[PDB]
Amino acid sequence: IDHTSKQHKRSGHRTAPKSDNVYLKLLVKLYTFLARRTDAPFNKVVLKALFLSKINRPPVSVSRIARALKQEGAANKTVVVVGTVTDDARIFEFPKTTVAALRFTAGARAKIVKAGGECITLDQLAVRAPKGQNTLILRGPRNSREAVRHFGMGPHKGKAPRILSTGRKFERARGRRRSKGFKV
Amino acid sequence: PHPKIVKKHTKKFKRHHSDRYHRVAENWRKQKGIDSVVRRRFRGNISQPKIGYGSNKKTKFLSPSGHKTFLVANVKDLETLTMHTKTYAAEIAHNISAKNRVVILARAKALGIKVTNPKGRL
């Protein structure tokens, strides 16, 4: 019985949300059903993105939505954000759209409604698009969180030192310039 | 109806050296010694609890009677096993007075629920 691999190794993927939220579990229930029956690749993506954690569902901005509909041919699709849809006061023009999020911010809800658009849930979406007909699934940038600039620090990575004060006297002298000993 | 009940290990799992010393109780305790013959499992030492001994899931929590034991305090608690007489056996709690046992055994037989304890408390 010369085992090739690790015996009784877990898949290593979330099969449920560690969230104990009642309304998320009702939403997972709907999408576990649709994922099983529909046999449309969309429903498997949405089920997993519902299981995903706060660090892995970063907020998709309205400005990022406006950019994803700036694309040619994909201007009338429904914008599936699985996570928060945040506001961006940077842009001024916003088109008439329908966006299916978990949560909106009071600013994001104002801007999408004012353009003339429809703020959808995932169940309001599922009742109109069982197979995600004419959808555009988006994700916010994961590798922008402030913790990720310290991941795999060493010489000469150009990664952020974990520090609490940021001026001179704090981690610039020896080993950050050829003058004092060496550089990185 | 039930499959013929088997229990793979009937006799109790007494702690090692519970016989030898009085300070040591026979309440099972895993031998976490570096040289323990019980932990290392030498031919002739006691057997340890292993999940593999786990009773069949269709025969689990059934008494010899074939009824899952349900602790009952009062008539209110007995009156819940009414549509579950083939399934359960009412057992009056240890701290119930003789007069309250008179009432429960009266009601138990009136509904047709098997009881393991009284006895009538003579």
């Binding site: 019985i1 010369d2 085992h3 090739t4 | -």
Partner: protein
């Protein structure tokens, strides 16, 4: 909703025409084997009469069974036995004889017994110990529907069609052999003979290439 003498009768009619294809195929393979023996036997007799010896074509199929435990196997043979899928003792696989395989058998010789598997022994193995890889989940065959589901892509539609694509090394040998789960044989019926197994067969041991005597061993182990 009738669907009792329409759907049931339709797929029954489909089953009967399929068994009729399988019948004439198994009749074709019986004919293929019996004439192929007769030809080789007559060729040997033709040559003896001519006054000139006849070399039987080098065996192109070998049945490999791992006769060794799992403890104290060095990295080289160990990984070769992981590639032939002999991950436990009395595990059997098939291997098409090539240079890239004959040299693997030279490496793992001290951990296995192998030889030239007859038609009969192959038939008995795939009947009694026919297991398939389907969504890995090792599933017993028990029905030629399960073969022609997964291996119908390559043209094999039956147990006897699979046993054919092994016994006569086919263009879909790789597929048919890798589909078959590694045979889980038991220890032999009357033993090994052989007081000590882990010498080479020639010395009076058991391990290594036992040309035709694998058939006997394997049936005993079956």
């Amino acid at each position: 909703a009738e669907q009792v003498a329409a759907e049931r009768a339709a797929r029954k009619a489909a089953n009967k025409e399929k068994r009729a294809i399988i019948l004439e195929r198994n009749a074709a393979y019986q004919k293929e084997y019996e004439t192929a023996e007769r030809n080789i036997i007559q060729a040997k007799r033709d040559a003896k009469a001519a006054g000139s010896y006849y070399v039987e074509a080098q065996h192109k199929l070998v049945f490999v069974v791992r006769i060794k435990g799992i403890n104290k196997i060095p990295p080289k043979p160990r990984k070769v036995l992981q590639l032939l899928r002999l991950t436990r003792i009395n595990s059997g696989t098939f291997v098409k004889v090539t240079k890239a395989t004959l040299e693997l058998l030279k490496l793992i010789e001290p951990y296995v017994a192998y030889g030239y598997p007859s038609y009969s022994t192959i038939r008995q193995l795939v009947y009694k110990r026919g297991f398939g890889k389907i969504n890995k989940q090792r599933v017993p065959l028990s029905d030629n529907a399960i073969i022609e589901a997964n291996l119908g892509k390559y043209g094999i539609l039956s147990i006897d069609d699979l046993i054919h694509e092994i016994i006569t090394v086919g263009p879909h040998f790789k597929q048919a052999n890798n589909f078959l789960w590694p045979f889980k044989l038991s220890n032999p019926s009357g033993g090994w003979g052989v007081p000590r197994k882990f010498k080479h067969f020639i010395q009076g041991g058991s391990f290594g290439n036992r040309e035709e005597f694998i058939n006997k061993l394997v049936k005993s182990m079956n």
